[PDB]
Amino acid sequence: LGKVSDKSREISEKYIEESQAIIQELVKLTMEKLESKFTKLCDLETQLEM
Amino acid sequence: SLPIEDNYIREVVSKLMECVNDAVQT
């Protein structure tokens, strides 16, 4: 059981390496959807001044 | 061409080692 747990520890490290890249890709893919709303926000600076 | 009874007709009528070597190691 100690050998099974020592194998499962490096399998869990493999899944940490699996999960962190997906987290970073989510953080990247949030940015363009935010940036389109930033451009929609910057249009308001003249749409309210008119 | 004589018929035969039905009671005579009814009377006449590598995957193991793939886990052991892994269970010894882990």
Structural biology method used:
cryo-EM
Q: What letter would DSSP give residue B16? A: S
Nearest CA in chain A to B23: A4
Indicate if the alpha-carbon torsion angle A3, A6, A11, A12 is positive or negative.
Answer: positive
Task: Find all residues with CB under 8 Å of B26, minimum gap 6, and list them.
Answer: A3, A4, A7
Chain B contacts in chain A segment 5-44 (CB below 8 A): 7
If phi > 0 it is left, if psi is from -120 to 50 it is alpha, else beta; for residue B3 that is: beta
Half-sphere exposure of A21 (CA within 13 A, CB side): 5
Resolution in A: 7.1
The whole-angstrom separation of Cα B7 and Cα B13 is: 10
The amino acid sitting at A29 is L
